[PDB]
Amino acid sequence: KIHTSYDEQSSGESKVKKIEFSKFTVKIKNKDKSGNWTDLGDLVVRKEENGIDTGLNAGGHSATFFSLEEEVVNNFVKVMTEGGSFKTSLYYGYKEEQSVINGIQNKEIITKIEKIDGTEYITFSGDKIKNSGDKVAEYAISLEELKKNLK
């Protein structure tokens, strides 16, 4: 007879990243199968010359979340501190979705302000996933943490 086993665990935390004048990072939550907001990770907003480019950064995975043209830079910032509806150059979303396979060009993003737990959040209608039932992938970002870098 033989018997063997193994187990390992590791973690770390630090606040050492590129300056606010180059990129910034904010919270992000998603709607589960129960239709309730649940934590997902963080959103790295990179301030490029030719628009804005954003990337989801969860506890074991990362990818492009959405991106917009130079003509939408101030426009996106407006709908992300006050709400509104402007088109985006590309919308990929998080993994396990129908858009993330390739991306959606010219994708219409309709934002709205809503509270959740005493902080003001912003929610928006993404692509139509195939793991829920003809629904849209919906999310929530701390509008109060966006304002810190959107003002």
Short mmCIF file of C-alpha atoms in Angstrom, two decimals:
data_model
loop_
_atom_site.label_atom_id
_atom_site.label_comp_id
_atom_site.label_asym_id
_atom_site.label_seq_id
_atom_site.Cartn_x
_atom_site.Cartn_y
_atom_site.Cartn_z
CA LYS A 1 0.00 0.00 0.00
CA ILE A 2 0.96 3.72 -0.50
CA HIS A 3 -0.37 7.05 0.88
CA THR A 4 0.83 10.63 0.04
CA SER A 5 -0.54 14.24 0.17
CA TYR A 6 0.52 17.88 -0.51
CA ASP A 7 -0.82 21.43 0.12
CA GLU A 8 0.63 24.98 -0.35
CA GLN A 9 -0.64 28.59 0.13
CA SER A 10 0.85 32.11 -0.39
CA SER A 11 -0.29 35.80 -0.35
CA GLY A 12 0.98 39.42 -0.51
CA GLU A 13 -0.21 43.08 -0.50
CA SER A 14 1.44 46.38 -1.60
CA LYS A 15 0.51 49.88 -2.97
CA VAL A 16 3.55 50.26 -5.33
CA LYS A 17 2.24 51.06 -8.86
CA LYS A 18 2.66 53.66 -11.69
CA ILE A 19 1.60 57.32 -11.04
CA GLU A 20 -2.03 58.62 -11.29
CA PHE A 21 -0.82 60.66 -14.34
CA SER A 22 -0.26 57.37 -16.32
CA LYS A 23 -2.91 54.91 -14.97
CA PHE A 24 -5.19 54.34 -11.94
CA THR A 25 -7.16 51.40 -10.43
CA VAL A 26 -10.74 51.20 -8.96
CA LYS A 27 -13.11 48.50 -7.53
CA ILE A 28 -15.42 46.32 -9.70
CA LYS A 29 -18.36 44.00 -8.87
CA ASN A 30 -20.62 41.81 -11.08
CA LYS A 31 -24.21 40.43 -10.97
CA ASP A 32 -24.24 36.69 -10.05
CA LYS A 33 -26.93 34.07 -11.04
CA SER A 34 -28.87 35.35 -7.95
CA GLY A 35 -29.13 38.90 -9.52
CA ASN A 36 -27.10 40.46 -6.64
CA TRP A 37 -23.86 42.52 -6.82
CA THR A 38 -20.79 40.43 -5.77
CA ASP A 39 -17.06 41.34 -5.73
CA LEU A 40 -14.99 40.56 -8.88
CA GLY A 41 -11.62 42.37 -8.50
CA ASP A 42 -10.19 45.72 -9.73
CA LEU A 43 -10.19 47.84 -12.96
CA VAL A 44 -6.83 49.21 -14.22
CA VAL A 45 -7.78 52.37 -16.23
CA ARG A 46 -4.76 53.17 -18.53
CA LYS A 47 -4.76 56.78 -19.87
CA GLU A 48 -3.42 56.38 -23.44
CA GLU A 49 -3.03 59.18 -26.09
CA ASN A 50 -5.75 57.71 -28.41
CA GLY A 51 -8.61 57.21 -25.90
CA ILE A 52 -8.93 55.21 -22.64
CA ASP A 53 -8.21 51.47 -22.17
CA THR A 54 -9.36 49.46 -19.09
CA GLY A 55 -8.46 46.01 -17.73
CA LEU A 56 -10.07 43.73 -15.13
CA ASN A 57 -7.62 42.39 -12.48
CA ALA A 58 -9.18 39.64 -10.27
CA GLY A 59 -7.69 37.24 -7.61
CA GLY A 60 -6.01 34.91 -10.20
CA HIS A 61 -6.94 36.36 -13.68
CA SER A 62 -6.70 39.56 -15.81
CA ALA A 63 -7.90 40.82 -19.26
CA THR A 64 -9.08 43.98 -21.15
CA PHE A 65 -12.56 45.00 -19.83
CA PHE A 66 -13.42 47.86 -22.27
CA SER A 67 -11.84 50.62 -24.42
CA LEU A 68 -12.95 53.89 -26.03
CA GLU A 69 -11.67 56.38 -28.65
CA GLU A 70 -9.94 59.79 -28.11
CA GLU A 71 -13.31 61.43 -29.03
CA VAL A 72 -14.89 59.60 -25.99
CA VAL A 73 -12.21 60.38 -23.24
CA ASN A 74 -14.08 63.30 -21.57
CA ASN A 75 -17.46 61.77 -22.63
CA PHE A 76 -16.86 58.49 -20.69
CA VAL A 77 -15.63 60.47 -17.66
CA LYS A 78 -18.93 62.48 -17.76
CA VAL A 79 -21.18 59.35 -17.78
CA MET A 80 -18.96 57.76 -15.06
CA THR A 81 -19.37 60.70 -12.57
CA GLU A 82 -22.97 61.77 -13.54
CA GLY A 83 -24.40 58.93 -15.76
CA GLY A 84 -25.27 58.78 -19.50
CA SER A 85 -24.96 56.84 -22.79
CA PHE A 86 -21.98 56.99 -25.23
CA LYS A 87 -20.57 54.36 -27.69
CA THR A 88 -17.18 52.61 -27.16
CA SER A 89 -14.45 51.61 -29.69
CA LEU A 90 -14.31 48.07 -28.24
CA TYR A 91 -16.03 46.06 -25.48
CA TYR A 92 -14.44 42.71 -24.46
CA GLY A 93 -15.67 42.24 -20.81
CA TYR A 94 -14.45 39.66 -18.23
CA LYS A 95 -13.76 35.98 -19.26
CA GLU A 96 -16.57 33.32 -19.60
CA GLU A 97 -18.63 35.59 -21.99
CA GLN A 98 -19.77 35.92 -25.66
CA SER A 99 -17.93 39.24 -26.46
CA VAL A 100 -14.55 38.40 -24.75
CA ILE A 101 -13.84 35.79 -27.51
CA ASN A 102 -13.01 38.66 -30.00
CA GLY A 103 -14.66 41.99 -28.87
CA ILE A 104 -17.67 44.16 -29.97
CA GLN A 105 -16.84 47.24 -32.10
CA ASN A 106 -18.90 50.49 -31.66
CA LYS A 107 -20.64 48.90 -28.56
CA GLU A 108 -23.28 51.14 -26.89
CA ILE A 109 -22.64 51.62 -23.12
CA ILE A 110 -25.56 52.96 -21.04
CA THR A 111 -24.41 53.87 -17.52
CA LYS A 112 -26.58 54.71 -14.44
CA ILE A 113 -25.86 55.85 -10.83
CA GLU A 114 -27.17 53.55 -8.03
CA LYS A 115 -26.25 53.07 -4.31
CA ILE A 116 -25.58 49.54 -2.95
CA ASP A 117 -24.26 49.79 0.67
CA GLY A 118 -23.87 53.59 1.34
CA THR A 119 -21.30 54.23 -1.46
CA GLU A 120 -22.58 55.55 -4.83
CA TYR A 121 -21.92 52.99 -7.62
CA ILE A 122 -22.27 53.09 -11.43
CA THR A 123 -23.79 50.15 -13.41
CA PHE A 124 -23.80 49.47 -17.18
CA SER A 125 -25.25 46.96 -19.70
CA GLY A 126 -22.45 44.87 -21.29
CA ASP A 127 -22.63 42.08 -23.92
CA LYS A 128 -25.25 39.25 -23.87
CA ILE A 129 -23.67 36.22 -22.11
CA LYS A 130 -24.61 32.55 -22.88
CA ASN A 131 -24.26 31.30 -19.23
CA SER A 132 -27.37 33.12 -17.77
CA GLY A 133 -30.31 33.10 -20.31
CA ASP A 134 -30.35 35.98 -22.91
CA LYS A 135 -29.38 38.47 -20.13
CA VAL A 136 -26.73 41.21 -20.30
CA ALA A 137 -23.51 41.08 -18.26
CA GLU A 138 -24.03 43.86 -15.68
CA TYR A 139 -21.48 45.36 -13.29
CA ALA A 140 -20.95 47.98 -10.56
CA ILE A 141 -17.98 50.39 -10.05
CA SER A 142 -17.46 52.74 -7.03
CA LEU A 143 -18.33 56.11 -8.67
CA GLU A 144 -16.79 57.76 -5.58
CA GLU A 145 -13.37 56.10 -6.36
CA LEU A 146 -13.72 56.96 -10.10
CA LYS A 147 -14.19 60.70 -9.18
CA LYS A 148 -10.71 60.65 -7.43
CA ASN A 149 -9.08 60.22 -10.91
CA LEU A 150 -11.95 61.56 -13.17
CA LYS A 151 -12.21 65.12 -11.63
#
